[PDB]
Structures are given as C-alpha cells and as structure tokens.
Amino acid sequence: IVGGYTCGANTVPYQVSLNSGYHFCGGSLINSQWVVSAAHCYKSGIQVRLGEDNINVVEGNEQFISASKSIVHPSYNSNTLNNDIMLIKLKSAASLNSRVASISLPTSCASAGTQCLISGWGNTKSSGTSYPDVLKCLKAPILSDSSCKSAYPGQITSNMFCAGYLEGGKDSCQGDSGGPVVCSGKLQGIVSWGSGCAQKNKPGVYTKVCNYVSWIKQTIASN
Numbered sequence: 001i002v003g004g005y006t007c008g009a010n011t012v013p014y015q016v017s018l019n020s021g022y023h024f025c026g027g028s029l030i031n032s033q034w035v036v037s038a039a040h041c042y043k044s045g046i047q048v049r050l051g052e053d054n055i056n057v058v059e060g061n062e063q064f065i066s067a068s069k070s071i072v073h074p075s076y077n078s079n080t081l082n083n084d085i086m087l088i089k090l091k092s093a094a095s096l097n098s099r100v101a102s103i104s105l106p107t108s109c110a111s112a113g114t115q116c117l118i119s120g121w122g123n124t125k126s127s128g129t130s131y132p133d134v135l136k137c138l139k140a141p142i143l144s145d146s147s148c149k150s151a152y153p154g155q156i157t158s159n160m161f162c163a164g165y166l167e168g169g170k171d172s173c174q175g176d177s178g179g180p181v182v183c184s185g186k187l188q189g190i191v192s193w194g195s196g197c198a199q200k201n202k203p204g205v206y207t208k209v210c211n212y213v214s215w216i217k218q219t220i221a222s223n
C-alpha cells in the first residue's frame, strides 16, 4: 500500500496473508474454512495465516492453517487478468473471534463514489521497494467505469473496477494482490493489478466481487 496508514493490529480481522515460506499475496476470510484471493496468486503449497499484524513476528492472535485445495475461476485469463479470483479452502476451520473474522459477500455491486478500505502488506513505495511488516490501510473511492476505461484503454472488462486517486500518490501495490477492498462492510473488490503503483492517471484495478457471488456460493456448497 502506497500512501496509506498503519491499520492497527487486528483491526482488519478478515485480512489474511498467503504464505509459501514467505508472504506473497493477501486474501479475505469469507467463512471459517474459505478464503477469497486473486487467481494470479495461485500456487502450490499455500499456508493461510490469519490474525496477523507484523507478518515477521508471532504476537499471539495468529492461526496458521494449510490449504487443502484451491479453485481458480474457470474463466480466469492470466494474460488479461479477466476473472482474477480464486477460492482457497482451509484444511481445518479457523476459530473465529473478534480478531479473526469473516467478511460478508456483497448483496449488490457498489457504485462509483463509494468509499472503501483497501489493505495489505505490499510495497509502500511507488519508486523502489520497502515492505512494511505491519498491515497498511488505505481509504479510497471507487472510480467511474468511464474514468477507469479512459485510464486503461482496451484493458478494463466488466469484471474489473478502478479505485483510488487519479492524481496518484495513494494506491495498492505489489504484494497487496489478492487482498480485500471492503465497502460498507462488504467485500466488493480483490486487489488485482495496475501500471506501477500510485502513478498519476493509473489507479488500482480490482476484481469485481459482486459478479462472482453465485459462483462463490455454489463452489463452497459442493467443495
């Protein structure tokens, strides 16, 4: 997260870190046994880490649970990042509490102008690299589809939305992918892609979760 703020320990209780020896992506806990992330985060050997604040320190609220399976969206295209969504099942159910908690799926798609909370452990620099070890947060509005398509000609599908600031300076970044965009208490986006980070006229692009609620619910019900 570039240009954000330190969330505070365990203030984003649905935020997870996906670990394969090291943190590589975020995710969102949507029930005691399932996480939503980005399809481009797929890899073998994922451990889901819940209750984290500093990802390099065991502070006392963590649960580390290996994935039993992952399900990349059937229509994910890794070249265009269309349908950049996957589901990860935990081998055992997490113990839910005030600091490890699921986030609700949306009932309706959120509108341009709505404020959202974007979070992650990714790079905090638009030029160069610095990883923060504690969770960073950014409040950002959803941008209009027209301004999103104008920013990224030929690249925005109906399964993506832009959020952030066209002036630059505040954005998600590398290492935040797969993490949450929460608006009015519902998971509306997944950190997906952007050109650089926090660049002028290059806002963050996010997977449009509301398009996937039926697929998420049906997949969970049979897996």
Ligand SMILES: NC(=[NH2+])c1ccsc1
Residues within 6 Å of the ligand: 171, 172, 173, 174, 175, 176, 177, 191, 192, 193, 194, 195, 196, 197, 198, 203, 204, 205
């Ligand atoms: N600029 C962004 N929002 C971004 C997201 C993942 S990598 C870069």
